Amino acid sequence: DSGCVVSWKNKELKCGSGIFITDNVHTWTEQYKFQPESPSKLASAIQKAHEEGICGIRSVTRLENLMWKQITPELNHILTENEVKLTIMTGDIKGIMQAGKRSLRPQPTELKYSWKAWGKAKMLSTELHNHTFLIDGPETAECPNTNRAWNSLEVEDYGFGVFTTNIWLKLKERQDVFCDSKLMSAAIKDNRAVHADMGYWIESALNDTWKIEKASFIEVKSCHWPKSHTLWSNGVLESEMIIPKNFAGPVSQHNYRPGYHTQTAGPWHLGRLEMDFDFCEGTTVVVTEDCGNRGPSLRTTTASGKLITEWCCRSCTLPPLRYRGEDGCWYGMEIRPLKEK
Amino acid sequence: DSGCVVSWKNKELKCGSGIFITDNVHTWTEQYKFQPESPSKLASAIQKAHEEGICGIRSVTRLENLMWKQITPELNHILTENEVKLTIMTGDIKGIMQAGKRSLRPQPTELKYSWKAWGKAKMLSTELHNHTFLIDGPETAECPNTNRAWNSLEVEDYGFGVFTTNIWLKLKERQDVFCDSKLMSAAIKDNRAVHADMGYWIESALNDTWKIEKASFIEVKSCHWPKSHTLWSNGVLESEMIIPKNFAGPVSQHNYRPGYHTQTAGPWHLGRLEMDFDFCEGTTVVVTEDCGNRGPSLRTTTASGKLITEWCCRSCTLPPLRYRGEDGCWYGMEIRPLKEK
C-alpha cells in the first residue's frame, strides 16, 4: 500500500508504502455498509429457526441494524411466497445495543422454491400474520434476549467497494462471542496507539507512561474485542481497564490509566460518547480523601437544569474523566459532588 | 495523518486519515540516520567511564554503528584537547551484532573545558596513545563483551527531518535490555500484520489461521523486542516462536507457524536474510518420519559448490522454510538431507 501522507502536528511530509490504518470513524457515517448474499438463504434460515423458538434478532452492529431495514420487505415477500405464516417486524435502536443468547445456523440447504438472480422487481407488500418475528427494538418485555439471535453474520468476498463501500455477508457457520475480525484496525507509531472499527476509536498516547488519552463511540456493542487485534495484551487486570470487556473493550495494557478503575456503570446508556480528559465548563474538581466512594456516573447538570459548582474525587488523577453526548456533560465513576447528597 | 493510498493487490483506491505505517525498510538504506547532541557530553561520558574498566562499545543498531564512524575523529580531537590520554579506534561490523554487558551512564556534569556551539572547524588529527578505546569490530579476543558498553542511546527531540532524516540522540539515563521504542511500528488491517523498525519487516498473514508469511532482516540486533509494540501477546510459548527472542523476535502469537519450532541455530551469522516459504531452485522436500532430528541449518550447496538433490523433514509443513543471502540459499532448522550423512 504505497502513497504519501502529510503530517499535521509535525508540520512535515512523508512518503512510502506498507500498512495504512484509516479513518471513517468520524465526520460522517460513510461505509453504509452491509448487504447480504442471495436473500433466499437468510429467508430459509429464519423460517427454519422459527420452529425451535427463535423469537427475535438483536443487532450486533448498528450498521447491520440499518441493514435489516432494507431487506424486511423482501424477506416478508419471499416468506409469503413460500406459503409459511411468518411476518417480520423491525424497529429502531437505542443504546446500549443488547446481546442475545442464541444464533442463526445452517441448514445450508435453502428453500429451493425461491428465485436465483437479483433482477426480481415490482414487488408487492404483505399483511399481518398470527406468528410474527420481531427485530431489534424496544420490546424487551414480550420476549427476552434469551430467545433471540445474535452475532450470526460475517463479512466475505473481501467486502469493499465500489462504489460507496460494499460488504457481501454470509451467515456464520459456528457460534461465537467475539466481534467480526475481518474489519478491525490496530496500530502504533512511536507516540500513539489506536484501536479502530466501525464505531470505536480508542486511542492512547505516551507522556511518561502509556495510557489512554481519548476515545469516541458512535455505538456500544456487546461483543468481546478479539485478543488477536490488541497491542500489549499480557498481564492485564480486569479491575483496571477503563472500557469494560463486556462493552467491546480491548483486553490490553493500553486501555489502562493510572489512578482509575473499570467504568462498569458509566453513562453508557447514551448512543454517542466522547472520552476526553478535561473539565466540563463551569465545574472544577479537587482531590480529597474525605470525598465519598465511587458510584454511578452523574450528569453535571441536575434534572431541573442547574449546573454543579464543585466536585471531589477519592483517588483520581488530574485531569478528570468526563463524557459528552446529546444531553450534555457527564463525569467519571470515581467522582462525586463535593457536598451535595 | 490524512492522505490517499492506492491499493496494488486489490486494484482499488482509498482516502482518509489516521495512522500510517511506513516503508524505508527496503529499496535503499535511507534514514541514515543517527547524529548525537553536543559531542562534549559523550566525550565526558566516555572519559569518565574509561576509569572503571569500560574497554569497548558494541553497537545496538548498524545505523548507530555507522554513526560512530562520523564522530570518532571529533571525539579523539576533543579528548586530546582535554589532556586525557585516551584514543578511540573504530572498526567494521559483521553479524551477528553481539550484545555487551555494561553501559554508559551520567555524570550529566560534562567536561566544561570544551566548546558550546557547532561551528568549530579546521580540526587537526591526533596520534596513537598507550590507552586505547575500541569500538564494535572483530576484536572479540582482546577484550570480552562483558567489559563493553551496550544500549546507551535513545532518540529525543522527536528525531526526524528535514532533510534526509535526522534523530538527535541523548544517552540513556538508565540501563535497559529492550530496544528503543521511539522508532517502532506494528499494525494490522484485516489480512496482514507487520512489525517494523530500522531493519525488521516481520509480516504475517491469514489463510486459515494467523501465521508468519515473510520477513526481511538487514541486521540482526540482540535487543529484546518490547512487549508494548507486539500484537496478540498472550500465552506465547518460547519453543514455538520462529524468530528467537534473543535476536529481537516479537513476543507474539503472530510469530508462530504450525509444524515449526524456534530457529535458535539458523543461518543468523549472515547479515541479510530473506524469510520466504518456497524451495531453493533445483531442490525438493518430502515429508518423512524416517528423516533425522532437527539440527543446525545447512546450505543447499556444499563447500565445493554442488547442489543437493533431495531433502527430508520430520514434522515440517509444506512449503518449507528457506533463507536467502549473499552466499546463496539455506534451509530451516527442521530439514535434513534425505540420505547424505
Numbering used by the authors:
A (entry chain B), B (entry chain A): 1 to 341
Lines from the paper:
We have also done focused refinement on one of the dimers of the loose tetramer and it is determined to 3.4 Å resolution.
NS1 is secreted alongside dengue virus particles during an infection. It is a multifunctional protein which exists in different oligomeric forms intracellularly and extracellularly, and they play distinctly different roles. The intracellular NS1 (iNS1), exists as a membrane associated dimeric form and is a part of the viral replication complex. The extracellular secreted NS1 (sNS1), exists in higher oligomeric forms. sNS1 likely causes vascular leakage symptoms in DHF/DSS via two pathways—indirectly, by stimulating the innate immune response through activation of complement and Toll-like receptors, and directly, by binding to endothelial cells causing endothelial hyperpermeability. sNS1 when bound directly to endothelial cells causes barrier dysfunction of the cell monolayer as demonstrated in an in vitro trans-endothelial electrical resistance (TEER) assay. Here we show by cryoEM that the recombinant sNS1 exists in multiple oligomeric states: the tetrameric (stable and loose conformation) and hexameric structures.
